[PDB]
Enzyme design. Sequence first.
Site, PDB file in Angstrom:
ATOM      1  N   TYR A 243       0.714  -1.247   0.161  1.00 11.67           N
ATOM      2  CA  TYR A 243       0.068  -0.042  -0.006  1.00 11.67           C
ATOM      3  C   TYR A 243       0.921   1.259   0.109  1.00 11.67           C
ATOM      4  CZ  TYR A 243      -4.493  -2.293   1.263  1.00 11.67           C
ATOM      5  OH  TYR A 243      -5.581  -3.207   1.497  1.00 11.67           O
TER       6      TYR A 243
ATOM      7  N   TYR B  12      -1.890  -9.812   1.357  1.00  9.50           N
ATOM      8  CA  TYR B  12      -0.771  -9.279   2.184  1.00  9.50           C
ATOM      9  C   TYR B  12      -0.954  -9.671   3.749  1.00  9.50           C
ATOM     10  CZ  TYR B  12      -3.953  -5.795   3.098  1.00  9.50           C
ATOM     11  OH  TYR B  12      -5.185  -4.892   3.519  1.00  9.50           O
TER      12      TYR B  12
ATOM     13  N   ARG C  99      -4.622 -11.109   4.313  1.00  6.93           N
ATOM     14  CA  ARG C  99      -6.088 -10.801   3.765  1.00  6.93           C
ATOM     15  C   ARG C  99      -6.139 -11.352   2.485  1.00  6.93           C
ATOM     16  NH1 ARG C  99      -8.730  -6.710   4.466  1.00  6.93           N
ATOM     17  NH2 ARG C  99     -10.421  -8.596   4.230  1.00  6.93           N
TER      18      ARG C  99
ATOM     19  N   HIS D 243      -8.161  -7.955  -2.132  1.00  8.30           N
ATOM     20  CA  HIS D 243      -9.302  -7.124  -2.172  1.00  8.30           C
ATOM     21  C   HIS D 243      -9.039  -5.322  -2.365  1.00  8.30           C
ATOM     22  CE1 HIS D 243      -7.119  -6.027   1.578  1.00  8.30           C
ATOM     23  NE2 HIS D 243      -7.939  -4.835   1.523  1.00  8.30           N
TER      24      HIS D 243
ATOM     25  N   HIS E 148     -10.879  -1.972  -1.429  1.00  3.80           N
ATOM     26  CA  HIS E 148     -11.812  -1.363  -0.410  1.00  3.80           C
ATOM     27  C   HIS E 148     -12.657  -0.226  -1.151  1.00  3.80           C
ATOM     28  CE1 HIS E 148      -9.606  -2.292   3.154  1.00  3.80           C
ATOM     29  NE2 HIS E 148      -8.542  -2.422   2.276  1.00  3.80           N
TER      30      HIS E 148
HETATM   31  O1  FHB Z   1      -5.220  -4.259  10.480  1.00  7.70           O
HETATM   32  C1  FHB Z   1      -6.214  -4.349   9.943  1.00  7.70           C
HETATM   33  O2  FHB Z   1      -7.223  -4.035  10.896  1.00  7.70           O
HETATM   34  C2  FHB Z   1      -6.639  -4.287   8.354  1.00  7.70           C
HETATM   35  C3  FHB Z   1      -5.340  -4.459   7.608  1.00  7.70           C
HETATM   36  C4  FHB Z   1      -5.661  -4.760   6.168  1.00  7.70           C
HETATM   37  C5  FHB Z   1      -6.873  -4.590   5.660  1.00  7.70           C
HETATM   38  O3  FHB Z   1      -7.274  -4.376   4.456  1.00  7.70           O
HETATM   39  C6  FHB Z   1      -8.069  -4.237   6.629  1.00  7.70           C
HETATM   40  F1  FHB Z   1      -9.383  -4.221   6.099  1.00  7.70           F
HETATM   41  C7  FHB Z   1      -7.874  -4.162   7.882  1.00  7.70           C
HETATM   42 FE    FE Z   2      -6.544  -3.516   2.960  1.00  5.77          FE
END
Ligand code: FHB
Ligand code: FE
Lengths: 200, 200, 200, 200, 233, 233, 233
Positions: free
Chosen positions: F105, F144, F154, F157, F159
Amino acid sequence: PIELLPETPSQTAGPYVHIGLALEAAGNPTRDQEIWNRLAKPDAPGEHILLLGQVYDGNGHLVRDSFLEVWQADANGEYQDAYNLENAFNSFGRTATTFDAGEWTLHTVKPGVVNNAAGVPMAPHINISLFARGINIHLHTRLYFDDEAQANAKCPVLNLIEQPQRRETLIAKRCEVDGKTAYRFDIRIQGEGETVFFDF
Amino acid sequence: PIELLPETPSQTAGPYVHIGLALEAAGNPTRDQEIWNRLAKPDAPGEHILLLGQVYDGNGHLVRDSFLEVWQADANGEYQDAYNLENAFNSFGRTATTFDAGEWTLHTVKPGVVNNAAGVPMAPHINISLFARGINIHLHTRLYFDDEAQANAKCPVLNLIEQPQRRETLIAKRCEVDGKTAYRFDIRIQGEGETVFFDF
Amino acid sequence: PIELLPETPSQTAGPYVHIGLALEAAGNPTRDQEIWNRLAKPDAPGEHILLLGQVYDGNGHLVRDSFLEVWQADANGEYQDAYNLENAFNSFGRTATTFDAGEWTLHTVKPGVVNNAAGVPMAPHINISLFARGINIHLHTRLYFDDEAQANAKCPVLNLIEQPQRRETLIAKRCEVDGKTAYRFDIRIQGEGETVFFDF
Amino acid sequence: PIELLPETPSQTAGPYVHIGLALEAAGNPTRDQEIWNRLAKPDAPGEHILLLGQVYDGNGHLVRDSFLEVWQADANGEYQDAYNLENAFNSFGRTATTFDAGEWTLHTVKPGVVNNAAGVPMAPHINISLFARGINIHLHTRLYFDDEAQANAKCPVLNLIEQPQRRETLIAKRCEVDGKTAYRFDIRIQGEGETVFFDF
Amino acid sequence: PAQDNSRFVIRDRNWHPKALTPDYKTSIARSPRQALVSIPQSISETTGPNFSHLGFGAHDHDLLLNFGLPIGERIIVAGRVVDQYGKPVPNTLVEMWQANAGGRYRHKNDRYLAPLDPNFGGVGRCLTDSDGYYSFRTIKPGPYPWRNGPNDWRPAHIHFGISGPSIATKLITQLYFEGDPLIPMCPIVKSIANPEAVQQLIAKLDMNNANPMDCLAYRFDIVLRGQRKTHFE
Amino acid sequence: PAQDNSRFVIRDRNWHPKALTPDYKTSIARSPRQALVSIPQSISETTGPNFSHLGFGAHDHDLLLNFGLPIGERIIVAGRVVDQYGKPVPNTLVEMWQANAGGRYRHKNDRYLAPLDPNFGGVGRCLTDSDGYYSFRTIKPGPYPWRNGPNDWRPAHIHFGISGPSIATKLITQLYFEGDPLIPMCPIVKSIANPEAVQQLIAKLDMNNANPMDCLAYRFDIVLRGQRKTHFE
Amino acid sequence: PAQDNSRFVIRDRNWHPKALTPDYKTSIARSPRQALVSIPQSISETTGPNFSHLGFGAHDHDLLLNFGLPIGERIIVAGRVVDQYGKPVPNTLVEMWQANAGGRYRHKNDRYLAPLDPNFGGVGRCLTDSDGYYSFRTIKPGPYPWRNGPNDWRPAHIHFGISGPSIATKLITQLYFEGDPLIPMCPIVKSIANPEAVQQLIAKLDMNNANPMDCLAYRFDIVLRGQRKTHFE
Ligand SMILES: O=C(O)c1ccc(O)c(F)c1
Ligand SMILES: [Fe+3]
Ligand SMILES: O=C(O)c1ccc(O)c(F)c1
Ligand SMILES: O=C(O)c1ccc(O)c(F)c1
Ligand SMILES: O=C(O)c1ccc(O)c(F)c1
Ligand SMILES: O=C(O)c1ccc(O)c(F)c1
Ligand SMILES: O=C(O)c1ccc(O)c(F)c1
Ligand SMILES: O=C(O)c1ccc(O)c(F)c1
Ligand SMILES: [Fe+3]
Ligand SMILES: [Fe+3]
Ligand SMILES: [Fe+3]
């Protein structure tokens, strides 16, 4: 085969149909506007007449809770669909039988002639729908006039009835009421002289 | 919903009902004590009458293998349930139609008045149950008297019958037999003048 | 019963929501037009105020990655939905807490009174939606002002909170910043002094 | 294993419990005989006391719709089950909290000592059952008296509680009301000083 | 005046209840013994009244105000009228009548001992909108006993009447409420031999349309005979 | 200005994930312990911003150009925004953000060792058309690792943020990709208790929308709370 | 005085609803955080009040007569109180309370817009006979909105309180009506985890017990904790 959405199933109007469709009769206050049994206003073109009759069950007993809806052409043989009380004439109406006398009455004009889909003229007639407790799905009939023998003789509709005897069940008997032209039309739901009922 | 054990389904009594319930009729020897058609002994209080009738099928033909059960109050409008041949009067009896003439007979007394659950008086009546071959489930009816017109007019039961003309079907016709007061009560299972049958 | 299509399920905004909704914050180059925390330009009618606060987790620790969205009426108690940066005032804004200090800021005008669906006036308030990692579905709340005690006392929404003590969690504390009128609104997500959150 | 019929599941008494069980409180007319908060007639043997308290929720807010039921032995340590308004003493009673103040009251006598199933004496106590909206299944408790320390120290019931600190929650604190001996017993449903609730 | 431009799909008379359904006692003497005579469709049958210009009172469809407040469960009866092809039927007439919360009808002939509700009449009318939508505001009627078998009870129901575009479409029916245990036991309902047909008469609880803290809502969609153009006639 | 003409179907809080969903560690301390207070809808809740006049840049919705070409699987993410009644939501704001092909990111706080992509930003916005349609052009994000459990990853995805007609409809969600084996293992995914709800967040491969010899395509439709007119209010 | 001659089968706390059932918002603050302390049964626990000598009014169990006639569905609510062994519980106290036909309670605190019924109180009491039988005559209560989620409605119900032979058997519950669509959506009903347990709360239409042309009837049996003699103690 192709099948469409099925039509909502019908159910009897029941004994209290009045409350919904014949306010006066239910002995309830009516609203401003109500669809009733006076299709023609005095200054309506055509021959005003008074239709009346009773309804008999299979035992020959009067049906005092019946409800009827009528549909007819005006004097020019024309259907007036824009229902309005202001109108001099309306093609649609409603009537019911007295809980006592058991007679229904309608105030209108003798309908002009209209042709079938094939372009063949039909004798003057009044389309009727009968509702009541004990009638799961409403009965369709037509009223014809005894003074229209010639026309009746040639009706494409009346000719559809196989047995001639049954045809007569469709003819209203002209009479006079208070010196007014009246026609009596008795409906026999079942048995002797059962009235022709239609499907369309 | 809540469901109880279903009642044992009825079946026709059949043509031979007589062997079981009308010994003599079957043309068989009877037992010591039999439930028959004489509800009243000579010295029983009340007005001694003779009841007679015929049973008609839907074709207007005599039903000659019918079997009938009667239940009535004594002259004080009292139901005598403890059945005994010693009694002067039994509220219960049995009769059947002759294979020849096809007429049944009962020897009893004119029943007294009994009130309905609501405390309203019922006209003098006899509760009848009709059995025979061709009848899947017994037919229940009531015998009223023509000479009780006043009471009849106010019977909460007779009044439940919508059509006045159907009520007539329940009225026995007073006559005389050997100078004895008799009432004739014909049952018409089907058709013209069909006797009213009850459900309770 | 009737079931509509289900709403798309919510998901946490995650720790990186800034890249999407608060470019500056993410430490990323911004676009020409961005939705930020300056609802009102200096030449906007109404009392210009500064809003500030901190967000606390259930442990009393600062939530440094929260994202807030606000919705308020203009000074006339009017909702200006036509979002435009050309506008003197926009009813909608966005803010976020510093990764350092953990404080968000908003530059607006004090909203004017608005009536509920029943015609009853609500005390001036700012509709706030809270987002952050760990928050599965955004939390809804309202910011009211301490200097509107009279109005607050009669707010129909405020009055829906059963416990008077909880109503106080919704009142911003008036202060001054650089000789400017400011209100401090701290949100406590969980525990002691937990901020009231709504469902609508 | 052997399974018996399942017991009918409990449901919250709801906020209108008053209507069915605390008639006065509902602000409705009562019947001739009601079960209420006066267990002892003034002429009943034993030490007459006034009991009172409040019920707190997990937030420390009074529970103003609580409903309670008590069960205690008479002054001789005897359970009087034949409930009668005529009796000088009834072992059973009912109370509820004021919608305003949020306090309940009971008029009874200090219970005598009863033995456990093992023949071991328990300290004088009142059996309490608490009902209210938000309470799915009634909470069971016991009220002990601060002036019976010796007995309390040896109660087999009180001794079943692991942490001595929690035993304290069951002890009513003696006071005086209008020169009358009173004991105050507050209930904390949840949190700091949560009252011990039993299962049996 | 009206013109013969449409044709209406033939009625399926095995879908609808038959005329003679003996369990429904009255049907015995009130049903024909001869077969119906089928006839081609003409202008007589393919036209009907248009109630667009009827003068509706402001509360015509609001049973709560059109007769204080009625006692009973406040509900919205809403839905759409469509033809068999799925086409909405706009500006059509829907008339309804029912008993009160106690199953008592405001009619002379109704001798049931449940009392009348001084604030309740029991009649409504509404013309569908351009999307074939209709709505009523009333109270859920109560079941009521009737002289059929010795212990017959009508399920709770609202009587309905729909005009449609022609006399060929006109229909009278009854609305029933989802889950009502009396439905399967009613001889009127049972005049309909297809279970599937019966389901069409059951109004579904519609939480989406309810007014929180005020009244619930039921959805009742109605289907009239499909209307098509004439072809190669 | 905005008008209180609408009502929005009440959210199903058992459909959406709950506030406290322990396996998703952060939620423990960031979830309220008191119940949410239900409030009637007012103008405050039934209105919201209209971004029709927001001045969108030409490549706002094109992640391949809006930041050389990014490295990664070139995809089109398109769909329609509708309400629970199936009504399109025209002129609504759709905002997205994601990681690069490596699951990196472009944000300060991101310490994952997967390198940044010189030509990739990871933010997009698009205003739905008259039919409720939107489309973005980007690269498929990589999964990641994250400090949740000791080996949590995760699924890939995107957002998403959708405004809709009012603050009552406003939503933040995440799009996952069809067949991703990481889906069922994710504690964030699982915050959602109904598997049927999970299905709603899975974008489907859409070969019909792909550009042959260029880029694939995924389809993601979004359903916002149903909007109805107030009635008998 | 009472005697310790009995033991009651231990309650199944997984059958009954738990104290904390978050969907039912008020349970949040009104449920203990500590586990209940189990204790052996003693005379304190195994005895309770006997209401055999309470002077009951003649219409205590007739809600139609105990407050003209109420408006609504006339019903008899009857059943039997048994213990888990299937043994009848004679001479026990059954207390009930409910709303009127419109879902309005005769209580200060009830602010619902449905009107009160001038002829209805909504309180009944009845002492089981020698066979554990009880009966009440009333009107079917209406559902009612309540401040839980934004659009929660309690299914029609009748609140019940049963004494049984001891404080150990004392129970407060709610009777629900067969086929009511609101049941599965009620958070209070859902406090009960086992769908099987829910079934026990549903009164069944009892046509057999109805008064033809008068009132319907519902059957609701109640099972109290099993009572057995002590042994080898
Ligand atoms: O740490 C978190 O809560 C976290 C990390 C990456 C994501 O994509 C997320 F939606 C939440
Ligand atoms: Fe994320
Ligand atoms: O007696 C009937 O035929 C009857 C009674 C009540 C109804 O609601 C009905 F539709 C019919
Ligand atoms: O003829 C009949 O109906 C008949 C004959 C024999 C039986 O056993 C009977 F039940 C009926
Ligand atoms: O608010 C509550 O907890 C509540 C309301 C109504 C009921 O009938 C009930 F059981 C509980
Ligand atoms: O539908 C029937 O059962 C039916 C119809 C016509 C008849 O003449 C008849 F005997 C039966
Ligand atoms: O959703 C839950 O499990 C939940 C919500 C609020 C509480 O206070 C709680 F203890 C649990
Ligand atoms: O039953 C539960 O979920 C429960 C009970 C006691 C607690 O302290 C808790 F956190 C949860
Ligand atoms: Fe009816
Ligand atoms: Fe045989
Ligand atoms: Fe209740």
